[model samples]
Target chain A: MIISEFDRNNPVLKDQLSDLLRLTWPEEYGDSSAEEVEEMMNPERIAVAAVDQDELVGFIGAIPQYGITGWELHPLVVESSRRKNQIGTRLVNYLEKEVASRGGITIYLGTDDLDHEHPYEFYEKLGYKIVGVLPNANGWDKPDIWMAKTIIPRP
Target chain B: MIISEFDRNNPVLKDQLSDLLRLTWPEEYGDSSAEEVEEMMNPERIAVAAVDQDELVGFIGAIPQYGITGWELHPLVVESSRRKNQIGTRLVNYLEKEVASRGGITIYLGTDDLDHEHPYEFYEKLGYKIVGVLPNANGWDKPDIWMAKTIIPRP
Candidate 1:
């Protein structure tokens, strides 16, 4: 399984990655085209995609909380069929590197705990610390767990 | 110190609490009279004031996140002149009681770690865990710490 550093400029990247968006969040985003994706994907905010045989497997979207020194991990989704592969991890690592290159300090994210199997442990293993937890926040019959990670800058 | 809970209907209560707000966040919310404070405080949200001699020394404003089941602690403020008096704690306790009575499951809050000297430790001492630490989030100025406390249901 080879992971492709996602390029919004290329049509192949957009069409392939679009599949992941459609499969995960059936409600496609307005900026769905290659050009639009290019405009949205800034160095401050990056998206990384995993590809295998022309199939888009997973991706992670991250954005620097503009005007603030923090970065927020929006959503990382992988194709349901390709679980346990390193696709998700690749996406995470790629975003982290991009954010650091731009001098971002801390990263934060929240996950719907009850909606999915608690992914807090997964983040913990990735070196994220559980800072807060909210019960039934989304008004969606479940709890939300927020996490954060500090990136060590390279000398 | 007597901690009193107030809502939109309580004009006197608002007047008492308004004194603290004027001192704490005067630039943002200035000269709030009893009527103005009463109109601003949400009826469903719980506003707790720690009063000393007819003046508000500290206060906590709690708002339901998404209608019900979740509460967010907002604008928890204490006068700079009255530190170490446990007034903030009493205000928080009052807020917790009100939230629990209304079936709130959890509480969430964000604080400026770099902006304040001891607030991060202050909240940590109160058993609020760090859910996320956003670095340089305030445009390379202040790191924001997002914290949460689980409000266990009374069995």
Candidate 2:
């Protein structure tokens, strides 16, 4: 799979991203809109897509609302049919490189409580760690899990 | 001192907030304006003020940019003359209750390097801990230090 820049502003490409966002979590993004999906892929944000034969199979993005050093990873998804090709891994690695080149020192994200176990292990293996947690963040019996990874080695 | 709700939408009250924002850190907020300050005090966000004799002395706010679980404590400041009264902590305590009432479980903030010494002692005294660090985030020698407090007892 080839990993490359995500043209979120391009309507055609964005439609594919909206589809992927739904596939990420239907209960989460099922009611979400393409406009809002594009909003996440907002200006100053950086994203990448995994492609096979120029068709997007998955994508990942980092929201840059934090200070110059940190960005939040949001809306990562791979087409169900396209999983297990390590496409998710490549999309993340590529995002880290570009974000770091732009002076991003850390990348962080939240794992929805609905299924935190597997994502936690996935991120941990990529050098991210549980930095904080919020109990009952999603109404009841649900929490938000935060994790972060330093892009460049610390001083 | 009376800790009261801040009606940031009120031009009169927001003027004081703008002044205090500048007072919080002139070098940083000198270029900032009342409109921008009010923008930080947006509708979904919550804030409080410390008043003495009907005059505003200091203020603090929580930016609810995170998910339902975590909100960010931003622009916490008490006037230099009023520091001895522990107004800062009081303001935070009050904010915590309101935030937690709204289902907030965590309050977090970022101390931009060059703004405060390592981890910001003031926040530490309030039970916040540095959770993550972004090296060289503010250019060459500066880093972004993140601190967070769990508002409710964890499960």
Candidate 3:
């Protein structure tokens, strides 16, 4: 699979991203309506997509957070059929490098282990340190684990 | 007394902004550490400050929310002794024009009206419209009045 910058206006990218997000993250981001996605990708988001045979199989969206040269990876996804192939990691690698080239100092992402049964160990193996666990940051049943990576030189 | 883009390494601008923020919105942002000011003066942030006779007296900070070309105005202030002068207005003017030129269409800001003490009317008089209010968005005894403005082709 190859990683590439996802253009928000590209019809294929938009449609596939919406499809993959709906299929993978239905419960977490189910209410992400068409209007919401339009607002999200309107002027274009800084995102990366994993492609194989010209098909988008995974994606990541990141943006600058308040009070820091930090990025909040809002949604990271791998198509259900494409999981376990390191697509998520490749997308993250692309995003980290892209943000770092622009002087971003930190990157953060949150995950929950409820119905999905996600691979927490995978992220930990990638050098993301567990920063905190919020009891209900995701909802009643979705306890969250916030993870972060330091990308900038320490002072 | 020249107006220019904000530079984080400039201690004078950072200190002056920190002091002005404490004075204008003490409760929302009294914890104005040097590191915090440094973080907020990022190059990606749309900020402008006013200097009076070579003394920094007022400033404005705005962030492009979610990388969507929408800006958020925060920590706008002029020194108390300089109120009734057009420092605050000029600060906003600089930010508005800069953001508009960069494709930013909307600006969001919030003001707390605890015991009706803060100036909600002042913001309203500046062409901002109240959009929403949450009882505890600020985590306080007072609620917040959220306001939004469209910079170009004013209504």
Candidate 4:
């Protein structure tokens, strides 16, 4: 599998990326209407994808937290079949490198407070520290766990 | 001081809201042009204002965290002369109660990692827990401290 930045401006690629997000986080993404999802695919947001033999297998989107040197990774997904292959990690590392190159030093994201099949441990293994929680943010029963990390600039 | 919901759609009030934001967060709001600030005062976003005999003295804006029952307090400001009067807290509490009334259970905001006259402790005093830190979020030299709270719906 090869990891690279996804062209958000490309309609076809963006559709695939959105589909991956919906497939990856159905409970969350599914709740949004198609129109809402389309609006979310703003060309200005940064993105990365993992391709396997020309097939998009994983994707990640980063929305700029403007006025600051940071971005929030909202939806990070690896195709169901490619979960354990480290595609997610590679995608995040690629994003961090790209952000650092542009003078950004912070990256953050939200996840389920309780495991429930979510990759809470994966984020921890990737050096993300739990910073805070939004009570029942995902819904009336699920909390949103906030996590973040600072990337040291490459010498 | 009277706490009231500011009508962002009202052309007259909108101008005052923008002015208050620019005055409160000059470094951040000043970075954006007048047109940008005007566009940001969208009617759809929720906002509340503190009035002193018909004059707008303080304002707090909440932008929906779409696809979830959450709202983020992006720019919450009270008049410079009104500091320490609990006006800021009242504005936030008013926002929280309003959000809860509308089925929103989660509220979040960010502050400077270094207080430096910023309201990091003020948020804490208002019961917002520090969740995490976004390095270099405010600028190259300052970090953004994430904080949030969950409001239990009224019985």
| Highest lDDT model number | 2
Per-residue lDDT over B1-155 for candidate 2, one digit per residue giving the tens place of the 0 to 100 score: 79978876577777877887776767657775665585677777887888888678888888775555678887777776836348877898999998998878888787873443233877788888776655544644556677877888765
TM-score on alpha carbons, each prediction: 0.51, 0.73, 0.48, 0.78
Give the interface RMSD of each candidate: 4.4, 4.0, 13.0, 2.5
Question: What would the per-residue lDDT of candidate 3 be over residues A1-155, giving only the tens digit for each residue?
Answer: 88987777688777877777677767634666454456457332467778888788887777765222556676777876636447778888888888777556667665664445255776787877765444322333234565777764555
Which segments of candidate 1 are over 4 A away from where they belong? A1-141, A145-155, B10-16, B30-40, B81-84, B114-117, B153-155
lDDT digits (tens) for residues B1-155 of candidate 1: 68777544655756666775675566545754444466348676777777678666777788775446777788687776645437777777778888878877778787776432377787888888876555556545466777877776434
Question: How many backbone overlaps does candidate 1 show?
Answer: 9
* lDDT winner between candidates 2 and 3: 2
Candidate 3 TM-score versus the reference: 0.48
Best by DockQ: 4
Q: Per-residue lDDT for A136 in model 1?
A: 56
- Provide a comma-separated list of chain B TM-scores, one per candidate: 0.79, 0.87, 0.80, 0.81
Pick by DockQ: 2 or 4, better one: 4
Greater TM-score among 1 and 3 belongs to 1
Clashing pairs in 4: A68-B137, A131-B131, A132-B131
lDDT tens readout by residue for model 4, B1-155: 78887765577666677677677667757656365456556665777888888778887778777343787886766777736448888888898988877777778887764522457777877788876666666556567777888877533
TM-score of chain A of 1: 0.75
Question: All models: lDDT?
Answer: 0.67, 0.74, 0.65, 0.71
Please report the TM-score between candidate 2 and the true structure.
Answer: 0.73
Summarize candidate 4's per-residue lDDT along A64-118 as a digit string, tens digits.
7854377788667678763644877888888888777666677888876453235
